[PDB]
Design a protein around this ligand. Structure first.
Ligand SMILES: CC(C)Cc1ccccc1
Ligand SMILES: [Cl-]
Ligand SMILES: [Cl-]
Length: 162
C-alpha cells in the first residue's frame, strides 16, 4: 500500500465532472475544480487544468496526471507549513500517508483547527489523538473515510485499507 493507492480508494476515479460530498464540482481522483455553483466555471477550470477543450470529460491518463500533481502539492504544502512540518517529520512512513490524505482532502487550512490533535500526534499518544480526531465535523460528515485514516494514525499499519 502507498499514498496513491490509499487515496485512490478514498476518492474513487470519475472521468466526467461530478459533485463531491460537499456538493463541489470535481473530476478524476478527487480533483476539486471549483466551489462555485456554476458548471461553466467548472468546465473552464477543467480546460485550463488539462490544457485542452475537454468539454467536461477527461481520460484516465489525464486523471492520473492531475492526481500526481495534487499529491505532490499536498506534500509540498505540508513541508512549507511551519505548524505542520515538524509533526509530519516526526511521523513514521505509514502515518505520514494518513497526514497527506487529510491535507489532500481538506487543505492546509482545513486542518488548521486540529491543533490539539497535532500536538498529540507529535507526542505519539496514538489513542488519545484518535479520540480527539473523531470530535470533528470531518468525522461526522465522512465517517467511513475518517475512521480509516484515524485507524491508520492509531495503529501505524494499513489494516483499514486491506
Ligand atoms: C492535521 C493533523 C491532524 C494531521 C497532520 C499531521 C501532520 C501534517 C499534516 C497533517
Ligand atoms: Cl491544476
Ligand atoms: Cl465516508
Amino acid at each position: 500500500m502507498n499514498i496513491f493507492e490509499m487515496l485512490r480508494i478514498d476518492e474513487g476515479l470519475r472521468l466526467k465532472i461530478y459533485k463531491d460530498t460537499e456538493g463541489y464540482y470535481t473530476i478524476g481522483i478527487g480533483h476539486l475544480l471549483t466551489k462555485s455553483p456554476s458548471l461553466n466555471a467548472a468546465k473552464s477550470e477543467l480546460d485550463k487544468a488539462i490544457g485542452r477543450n475537454t468539454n467536461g470529460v477527461i481520460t484516465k491518463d489525464e486523471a492520473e496526471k492531475l492526481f500526481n500533481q495534487d499529491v505532490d502539492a499536498a506534500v509540498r504544502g505540508i513541508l512549507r507549513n511551519a505548524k505542520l512540518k515538524p509533526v509530519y517529520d516526526s511521523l513514521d512512513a505509514v502515518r505520514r500517508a494518513a497526514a497527506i490524505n487529510m491535507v489532500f482532502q481538506m487543505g492546509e487550512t482545513g486542518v488548521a483547527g486540529f491543533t490539539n490533535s497535532l500536538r498529540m500526534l507529535q507526542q505519539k499518544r496514538w489513542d488519545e489523538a484518535a479520540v480527539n480526531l473523531a470530535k470533528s465535523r470531518w468525522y461526522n460528515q465522512t465517517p467511513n473515510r475518517a475512521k480509516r485514516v484515524i485507524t491508520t494514525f492509531r495503529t501505524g499499519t494499513w489494516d483499514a485499507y486491506k
